Short mmCIF file of C-alpha atoms in Angstrom, two decimals:
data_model
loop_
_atom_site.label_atom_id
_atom_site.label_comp_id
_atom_site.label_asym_id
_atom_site.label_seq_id
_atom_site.Cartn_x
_atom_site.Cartn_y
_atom_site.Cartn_z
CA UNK A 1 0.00 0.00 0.00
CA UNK A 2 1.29 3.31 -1.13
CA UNK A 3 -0.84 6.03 -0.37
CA UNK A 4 -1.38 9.43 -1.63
CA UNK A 5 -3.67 11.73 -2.51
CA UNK A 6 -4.89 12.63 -6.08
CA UNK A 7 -7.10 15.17 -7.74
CA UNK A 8 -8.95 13.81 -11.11
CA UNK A 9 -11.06 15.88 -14.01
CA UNK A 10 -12.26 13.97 -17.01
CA UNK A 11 -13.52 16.59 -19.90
CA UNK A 12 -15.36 15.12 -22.85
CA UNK A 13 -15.03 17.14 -25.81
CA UNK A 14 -17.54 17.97 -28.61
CA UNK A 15 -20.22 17.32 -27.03
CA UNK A 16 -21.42 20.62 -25.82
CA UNK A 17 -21.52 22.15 -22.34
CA UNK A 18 -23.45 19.11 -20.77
CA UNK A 19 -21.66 16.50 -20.01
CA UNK A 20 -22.41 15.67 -16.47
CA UNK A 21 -23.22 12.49 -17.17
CA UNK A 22 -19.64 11.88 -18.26
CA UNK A 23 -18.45 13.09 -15.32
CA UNK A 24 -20.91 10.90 -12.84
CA UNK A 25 -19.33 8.25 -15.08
CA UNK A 26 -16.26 8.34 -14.15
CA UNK A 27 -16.71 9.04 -10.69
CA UNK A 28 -18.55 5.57 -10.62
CA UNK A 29 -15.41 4.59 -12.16
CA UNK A 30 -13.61 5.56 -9.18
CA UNK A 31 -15.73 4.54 -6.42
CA UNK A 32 -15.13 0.51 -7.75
CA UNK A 33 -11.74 1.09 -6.83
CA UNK A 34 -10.60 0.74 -3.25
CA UNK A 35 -10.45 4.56 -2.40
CA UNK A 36 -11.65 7.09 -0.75
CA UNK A 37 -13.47 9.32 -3.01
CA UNK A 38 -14.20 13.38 -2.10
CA UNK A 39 -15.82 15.07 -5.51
CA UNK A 40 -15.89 18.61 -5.61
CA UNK A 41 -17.34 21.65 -8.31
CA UNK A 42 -13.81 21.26 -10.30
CA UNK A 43 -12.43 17.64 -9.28
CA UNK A 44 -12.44 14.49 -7.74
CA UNK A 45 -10.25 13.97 -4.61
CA UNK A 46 -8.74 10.61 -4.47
CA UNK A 47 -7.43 9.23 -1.69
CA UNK A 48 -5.80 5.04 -2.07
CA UNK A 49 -2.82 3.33 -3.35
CA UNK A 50 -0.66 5.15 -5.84
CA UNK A 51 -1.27 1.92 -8.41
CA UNK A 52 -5.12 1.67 -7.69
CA UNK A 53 -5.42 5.68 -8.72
CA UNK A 54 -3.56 5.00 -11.54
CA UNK A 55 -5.79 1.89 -12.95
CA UNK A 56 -8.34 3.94 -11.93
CA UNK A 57 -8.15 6.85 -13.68
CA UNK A 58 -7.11 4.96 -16.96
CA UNK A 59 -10.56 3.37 -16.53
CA UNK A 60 -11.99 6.26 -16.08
CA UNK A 61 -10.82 8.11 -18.99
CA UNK A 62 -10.70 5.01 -21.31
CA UNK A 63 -14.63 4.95 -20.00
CA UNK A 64 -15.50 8.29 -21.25
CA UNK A 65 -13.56 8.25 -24.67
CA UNK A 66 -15.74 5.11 -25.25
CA UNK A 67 -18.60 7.32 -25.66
CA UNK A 68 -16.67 10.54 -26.87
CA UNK A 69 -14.29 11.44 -29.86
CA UNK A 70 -11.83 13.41 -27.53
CA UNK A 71 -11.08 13.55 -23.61
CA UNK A 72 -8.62 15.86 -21.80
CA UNK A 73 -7.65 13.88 -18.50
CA UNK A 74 -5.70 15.32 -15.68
CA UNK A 75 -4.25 13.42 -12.94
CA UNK A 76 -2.73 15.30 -10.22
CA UNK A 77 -0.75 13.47 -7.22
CA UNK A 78 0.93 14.64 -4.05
CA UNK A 79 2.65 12.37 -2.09
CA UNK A 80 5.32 13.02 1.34
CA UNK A 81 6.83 10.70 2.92
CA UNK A 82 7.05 12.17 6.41
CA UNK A 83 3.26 12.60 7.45
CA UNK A 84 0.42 10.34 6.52
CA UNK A 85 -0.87 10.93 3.17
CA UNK A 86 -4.63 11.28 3.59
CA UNK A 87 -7.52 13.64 2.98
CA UNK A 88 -8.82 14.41 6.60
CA UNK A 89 -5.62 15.16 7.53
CA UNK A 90 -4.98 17.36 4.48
CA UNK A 91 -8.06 19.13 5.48
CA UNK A 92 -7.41 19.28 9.06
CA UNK A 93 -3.99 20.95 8.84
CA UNK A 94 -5.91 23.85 7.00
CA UNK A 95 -8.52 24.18 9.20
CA UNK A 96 -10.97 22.66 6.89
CA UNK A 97 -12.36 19.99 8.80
CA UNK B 1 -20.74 40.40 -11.86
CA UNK B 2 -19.52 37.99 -14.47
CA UNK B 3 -20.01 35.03 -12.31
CA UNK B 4 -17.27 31.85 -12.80
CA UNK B 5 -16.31 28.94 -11.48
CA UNK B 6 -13.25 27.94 -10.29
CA UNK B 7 -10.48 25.83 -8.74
CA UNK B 8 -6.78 27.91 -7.14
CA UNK B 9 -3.68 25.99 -5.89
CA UNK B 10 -1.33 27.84 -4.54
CA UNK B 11 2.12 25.77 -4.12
CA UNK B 12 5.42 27.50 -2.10
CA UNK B 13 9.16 25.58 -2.86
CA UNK B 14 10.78 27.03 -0.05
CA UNK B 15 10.43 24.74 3.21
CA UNK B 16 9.62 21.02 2.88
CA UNK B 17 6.23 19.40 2.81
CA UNK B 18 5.37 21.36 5.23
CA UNK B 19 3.38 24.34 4.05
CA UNK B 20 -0.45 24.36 5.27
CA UNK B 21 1.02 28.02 6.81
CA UNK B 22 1.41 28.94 3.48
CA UNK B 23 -1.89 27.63 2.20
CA UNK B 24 -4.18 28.65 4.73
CA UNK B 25 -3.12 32.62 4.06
CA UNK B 26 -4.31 31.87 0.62
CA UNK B 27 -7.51 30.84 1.91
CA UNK B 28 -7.98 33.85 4.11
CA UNK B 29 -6.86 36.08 1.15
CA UNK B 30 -9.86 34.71 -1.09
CA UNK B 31 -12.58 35.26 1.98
CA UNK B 32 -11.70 38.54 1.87
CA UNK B 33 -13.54 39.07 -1.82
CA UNK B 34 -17.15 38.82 -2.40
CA UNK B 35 -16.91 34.81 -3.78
CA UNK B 36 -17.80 32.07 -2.56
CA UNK B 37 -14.80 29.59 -0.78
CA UNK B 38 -14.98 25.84 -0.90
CA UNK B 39 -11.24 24.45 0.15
CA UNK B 40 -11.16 20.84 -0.93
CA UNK B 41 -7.85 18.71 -0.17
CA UNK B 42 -5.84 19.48 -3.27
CA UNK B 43 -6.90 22.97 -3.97
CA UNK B 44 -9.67 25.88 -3.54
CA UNK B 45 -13.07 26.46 -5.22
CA UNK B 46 -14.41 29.76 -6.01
CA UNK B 47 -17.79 31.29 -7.35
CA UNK B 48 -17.66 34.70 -8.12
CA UNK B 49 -16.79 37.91 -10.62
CA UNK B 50 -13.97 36.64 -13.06
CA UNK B 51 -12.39 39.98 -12.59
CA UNK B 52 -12.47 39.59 -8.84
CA UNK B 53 -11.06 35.68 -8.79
CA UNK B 54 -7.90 37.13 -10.88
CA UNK B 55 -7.63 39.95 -8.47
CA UNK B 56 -8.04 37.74 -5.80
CA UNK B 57 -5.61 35.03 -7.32
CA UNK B 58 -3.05 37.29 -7.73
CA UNK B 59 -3.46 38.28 -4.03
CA UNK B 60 -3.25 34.82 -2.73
CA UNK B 61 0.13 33.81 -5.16
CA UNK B 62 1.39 36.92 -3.89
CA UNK B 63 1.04 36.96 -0.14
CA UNK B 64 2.66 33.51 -0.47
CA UNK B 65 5.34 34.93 -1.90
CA UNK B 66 5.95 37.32 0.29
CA UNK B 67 7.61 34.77 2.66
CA UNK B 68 8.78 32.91 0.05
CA UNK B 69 11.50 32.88 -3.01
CA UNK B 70 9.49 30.86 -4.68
CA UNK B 71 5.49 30.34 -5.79
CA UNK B 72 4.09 28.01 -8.51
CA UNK B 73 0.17 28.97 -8.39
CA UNK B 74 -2.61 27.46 -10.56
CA UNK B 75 -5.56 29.03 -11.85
CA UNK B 76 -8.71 26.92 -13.58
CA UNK B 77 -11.62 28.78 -14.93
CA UNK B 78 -14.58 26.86 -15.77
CA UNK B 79 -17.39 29.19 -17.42
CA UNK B 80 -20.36 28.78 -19.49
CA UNK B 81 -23.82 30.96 -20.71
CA UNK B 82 -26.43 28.18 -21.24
CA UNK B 83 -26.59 27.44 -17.30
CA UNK B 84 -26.07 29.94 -14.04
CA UNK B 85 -21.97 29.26 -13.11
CA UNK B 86 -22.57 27.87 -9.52
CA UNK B 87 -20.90 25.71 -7.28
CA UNK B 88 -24.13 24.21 -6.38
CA UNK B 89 -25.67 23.42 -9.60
CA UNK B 90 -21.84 21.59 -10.54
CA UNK B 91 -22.03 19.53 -7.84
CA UNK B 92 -25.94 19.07 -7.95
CA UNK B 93 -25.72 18.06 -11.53
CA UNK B 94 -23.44 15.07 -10.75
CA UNK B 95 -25.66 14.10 -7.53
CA UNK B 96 -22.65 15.24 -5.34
CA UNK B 97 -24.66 17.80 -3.13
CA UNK C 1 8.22 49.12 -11.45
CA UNK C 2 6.64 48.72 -14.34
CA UNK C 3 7.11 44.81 -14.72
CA UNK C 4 6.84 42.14 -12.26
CA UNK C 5 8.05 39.26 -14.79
CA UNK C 6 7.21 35.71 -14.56
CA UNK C 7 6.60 32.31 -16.67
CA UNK C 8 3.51 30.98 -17.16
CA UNK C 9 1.44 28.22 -19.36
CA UNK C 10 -2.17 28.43 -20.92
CA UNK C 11 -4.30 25.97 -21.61
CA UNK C 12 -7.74 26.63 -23.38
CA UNK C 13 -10.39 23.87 -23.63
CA UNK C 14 -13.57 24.80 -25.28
CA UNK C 15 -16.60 22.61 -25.31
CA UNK C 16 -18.20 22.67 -27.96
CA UNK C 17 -20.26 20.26 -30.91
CA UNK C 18 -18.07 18.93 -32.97
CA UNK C 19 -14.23 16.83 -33.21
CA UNK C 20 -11.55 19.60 -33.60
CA UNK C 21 -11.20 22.92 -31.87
CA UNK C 22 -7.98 23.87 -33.17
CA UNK C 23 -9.55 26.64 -34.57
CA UNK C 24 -10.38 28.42 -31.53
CA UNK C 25 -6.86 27.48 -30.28
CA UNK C 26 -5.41 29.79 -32.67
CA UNK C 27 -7.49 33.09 -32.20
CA UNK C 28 -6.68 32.46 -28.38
CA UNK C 29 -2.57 32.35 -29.46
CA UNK C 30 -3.50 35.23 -31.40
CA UNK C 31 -5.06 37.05 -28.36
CA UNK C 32 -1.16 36.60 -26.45
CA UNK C 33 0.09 38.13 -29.65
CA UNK C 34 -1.62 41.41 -28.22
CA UNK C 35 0.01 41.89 -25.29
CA UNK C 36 4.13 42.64 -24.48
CA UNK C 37 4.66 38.81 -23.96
CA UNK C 38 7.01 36.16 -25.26
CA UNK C 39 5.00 33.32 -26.70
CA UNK C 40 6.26 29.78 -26.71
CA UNK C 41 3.20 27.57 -27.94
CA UNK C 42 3.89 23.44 -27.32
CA UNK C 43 1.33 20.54 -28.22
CA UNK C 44 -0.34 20.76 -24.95
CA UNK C 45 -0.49 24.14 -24.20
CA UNK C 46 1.15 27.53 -23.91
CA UNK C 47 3.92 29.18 -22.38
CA UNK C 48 4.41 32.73 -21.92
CA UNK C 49 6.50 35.00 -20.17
CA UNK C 50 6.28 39.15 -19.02
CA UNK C 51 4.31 41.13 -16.30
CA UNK C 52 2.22 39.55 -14.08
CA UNK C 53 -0.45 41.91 -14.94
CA UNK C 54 -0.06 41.58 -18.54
CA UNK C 55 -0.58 37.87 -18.40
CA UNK C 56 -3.85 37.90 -16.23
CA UNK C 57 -5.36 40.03 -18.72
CA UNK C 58 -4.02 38.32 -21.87
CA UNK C 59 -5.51 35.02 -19.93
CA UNK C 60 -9.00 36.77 -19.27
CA UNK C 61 -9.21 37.78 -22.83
CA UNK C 62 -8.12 34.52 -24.34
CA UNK C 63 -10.30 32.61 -22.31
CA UNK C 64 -13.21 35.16 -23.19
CA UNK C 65 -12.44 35.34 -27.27
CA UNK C 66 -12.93 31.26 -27.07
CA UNK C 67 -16.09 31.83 -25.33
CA UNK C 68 -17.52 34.30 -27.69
CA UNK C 69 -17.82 31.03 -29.94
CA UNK C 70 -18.54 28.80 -27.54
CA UNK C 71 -21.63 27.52 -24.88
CA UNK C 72 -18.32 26.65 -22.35
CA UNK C 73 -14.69 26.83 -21.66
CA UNK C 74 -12.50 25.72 -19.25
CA UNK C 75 -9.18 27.43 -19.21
CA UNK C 76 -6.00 26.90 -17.11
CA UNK C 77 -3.68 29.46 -16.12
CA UNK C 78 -0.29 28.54 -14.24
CA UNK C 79 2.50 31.06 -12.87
CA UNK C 80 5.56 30.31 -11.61
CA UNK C 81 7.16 33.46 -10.13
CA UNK C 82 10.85 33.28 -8.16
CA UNK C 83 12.50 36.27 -6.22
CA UNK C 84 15.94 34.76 -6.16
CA UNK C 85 16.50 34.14 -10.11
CA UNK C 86 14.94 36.01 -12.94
CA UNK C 87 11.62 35.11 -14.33
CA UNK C 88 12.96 33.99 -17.92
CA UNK C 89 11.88 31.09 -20.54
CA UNK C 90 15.60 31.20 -21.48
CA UNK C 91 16.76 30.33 -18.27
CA UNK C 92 14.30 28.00 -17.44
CA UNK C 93 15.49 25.63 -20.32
CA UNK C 94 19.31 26.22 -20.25
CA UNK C 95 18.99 25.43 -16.36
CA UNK C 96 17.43 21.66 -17.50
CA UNK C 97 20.39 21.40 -20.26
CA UNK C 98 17.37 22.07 -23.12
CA UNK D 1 -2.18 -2.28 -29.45
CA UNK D 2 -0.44 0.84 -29.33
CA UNK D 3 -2.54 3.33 -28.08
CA UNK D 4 -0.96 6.84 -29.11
CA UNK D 5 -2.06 10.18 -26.98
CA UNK D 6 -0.26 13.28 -26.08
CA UNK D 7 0.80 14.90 -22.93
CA UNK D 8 2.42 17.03 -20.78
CA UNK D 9 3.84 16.27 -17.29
CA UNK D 10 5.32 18.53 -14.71
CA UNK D 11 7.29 17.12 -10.97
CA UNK D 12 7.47 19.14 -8.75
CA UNK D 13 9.41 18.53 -5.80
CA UNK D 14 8.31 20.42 -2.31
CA UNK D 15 11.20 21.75 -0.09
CA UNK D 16 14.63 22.34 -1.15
CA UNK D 17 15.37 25.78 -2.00
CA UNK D 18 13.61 27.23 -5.02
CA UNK D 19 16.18 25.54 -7.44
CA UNK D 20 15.12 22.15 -8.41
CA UNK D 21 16.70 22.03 -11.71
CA UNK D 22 18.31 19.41 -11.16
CA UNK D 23 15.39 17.25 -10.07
CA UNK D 24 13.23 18.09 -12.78
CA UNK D 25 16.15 17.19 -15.07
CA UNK D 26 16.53 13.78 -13.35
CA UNK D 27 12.50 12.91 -14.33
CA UNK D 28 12.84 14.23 -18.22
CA UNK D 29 15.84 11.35 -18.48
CA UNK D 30 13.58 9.58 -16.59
CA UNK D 31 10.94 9.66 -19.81
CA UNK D 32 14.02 9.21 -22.17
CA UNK D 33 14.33 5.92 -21.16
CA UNK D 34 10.49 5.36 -22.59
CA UNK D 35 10.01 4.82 -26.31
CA UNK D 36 8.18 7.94 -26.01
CA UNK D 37 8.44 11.54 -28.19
CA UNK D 38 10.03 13.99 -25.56
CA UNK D 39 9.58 17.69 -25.49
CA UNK D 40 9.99 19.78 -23.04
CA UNK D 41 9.02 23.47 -22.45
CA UNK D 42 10.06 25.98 -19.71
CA UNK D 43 6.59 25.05 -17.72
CA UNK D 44 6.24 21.10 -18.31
CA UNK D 45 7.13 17.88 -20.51
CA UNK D 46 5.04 17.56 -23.56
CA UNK D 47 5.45 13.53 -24.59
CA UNK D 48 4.10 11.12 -27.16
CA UNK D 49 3.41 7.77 -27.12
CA UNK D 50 1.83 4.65 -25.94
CA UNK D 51 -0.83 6.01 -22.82
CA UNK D 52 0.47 2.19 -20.60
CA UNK D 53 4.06 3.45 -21.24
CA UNK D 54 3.26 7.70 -20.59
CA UNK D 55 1.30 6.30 -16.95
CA UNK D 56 4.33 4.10 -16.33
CA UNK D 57 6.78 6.73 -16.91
CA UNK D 58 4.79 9.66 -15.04
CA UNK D 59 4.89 6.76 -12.10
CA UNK D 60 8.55 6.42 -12.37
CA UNK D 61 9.65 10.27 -12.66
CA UNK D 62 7.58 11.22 -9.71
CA UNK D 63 8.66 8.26 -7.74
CA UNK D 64 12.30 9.37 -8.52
CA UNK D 65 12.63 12.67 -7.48
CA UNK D 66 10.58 11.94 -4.66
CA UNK D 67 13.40 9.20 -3.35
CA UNK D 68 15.80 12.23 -2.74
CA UNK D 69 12.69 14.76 -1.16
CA UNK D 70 10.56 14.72 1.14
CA UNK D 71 7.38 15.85 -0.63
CA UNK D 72 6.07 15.89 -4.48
CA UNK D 73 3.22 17.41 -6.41
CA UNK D 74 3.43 15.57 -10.01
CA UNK D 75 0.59 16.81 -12.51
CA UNK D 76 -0.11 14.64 -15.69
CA UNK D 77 -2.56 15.74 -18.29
CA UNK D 78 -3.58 13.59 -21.05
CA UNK D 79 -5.17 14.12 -24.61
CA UNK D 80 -6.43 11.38 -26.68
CA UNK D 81 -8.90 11.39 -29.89
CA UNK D 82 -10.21 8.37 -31.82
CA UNK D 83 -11.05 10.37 -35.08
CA UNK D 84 -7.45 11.47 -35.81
CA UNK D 85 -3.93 10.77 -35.53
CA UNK D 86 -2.53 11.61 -31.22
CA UNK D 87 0.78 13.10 -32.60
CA UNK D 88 2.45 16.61 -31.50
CA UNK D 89 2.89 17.30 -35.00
CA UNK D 90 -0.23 17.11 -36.42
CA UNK D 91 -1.80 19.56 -33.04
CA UNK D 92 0.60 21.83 -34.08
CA UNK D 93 0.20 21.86 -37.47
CA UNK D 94 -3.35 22.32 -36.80
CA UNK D 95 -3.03 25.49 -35.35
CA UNK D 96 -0.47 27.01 -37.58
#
């Protein structure tokens, strides 16, 4: 197990402004995985193994081209290895939780 | 009031990992403007006037790097005229409310 | 006084019907063309460097040409800004060897 | 079963001094070592190449520079399209 935390946004293109269902796709995507899942207006926060978030957002990419022409994925990952990498402590630190 | 959504990170290489210091007085900086402030665990989500998330933006970066030598800030602007730019019809419209 | 330099990158994504929005890719680089910026455009995005300032509002307008055409667009806007070195494209790639 | 896309990575390490040169150097020969296109830009790494081998690599660089700090922030943004080519030359030649 190799925590960290991640921030996904899959964005189906040329299919007009709505394309929530796209991205309620791929969170379903995400939620098969073993993680903890936080999604927000701009993102979803992923919290598991390093490997798992990879697969994962693969799938969920892969998932929305099936049904799309074009997708513009972004995976974003911070990882320390001094504190525990998780989300409520993330928050907490901030004073967000 | 040319109301936008979107999603700041503001990121300080000067000490190690530890930086919540740094990214709570970004926080603080965007409460100060009329928008609305959801902090998630890899970044910040804003509602407001474009003109006043730049100002705002540039606030935050700078005040960062005021203690800093360093800043790497992102900006993500998500905006659209067929449907009212809100955090809570985003998050409604993926059944994450 | 007068300039508060730093590097940036641009991304524009516009969503709209149909595959291929190169063309709205373009009037955004021309937009950057505008302003008292260097312009380094890549496959993915692009890079620019000059005043703060200058950049937010060649950003805002970029973003806002794309949208003129457009029922959405998400755009991305990154700065990196150092007071130790100078702010400069050039040195940014002869400092990786490139 | 190659499955082409394009794009653009940045590592970013978290505490060392402002200069981390040499850091981000160490995860662009990282993607060398990939049969991938490499080019980088003064803001990221723009590659080409199999999506399995661009995941794979963005895994390696950010696990390397993280072995010698204590913290990294690695961003990886992909761009794939099923009704043309996923090359760097042909996005480029598309806008001028």
């Amino acid at each position: 197990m190799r925590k960290v935390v991640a921030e996904v946004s899959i964005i189906p293109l040329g299919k007009g402004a709505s394309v929530s269902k796209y991205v309620k796709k791929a969170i379903e995507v995400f939620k098969k995985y073993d993680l903890k899942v936080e999604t927000n207006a701009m993102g979803t926060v992923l919290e598991g193994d390093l490997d798992e978030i990879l697969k994962a957002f693969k799938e969920a990419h892969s998932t929305v081209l099936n049904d799309v022409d074009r997708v513009v994925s972004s995976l974003k990952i911070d990882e320390r290895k001094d504190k525990e990498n998780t989300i409520e402590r993330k928050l907490k630190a901030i004073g967000e939780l």
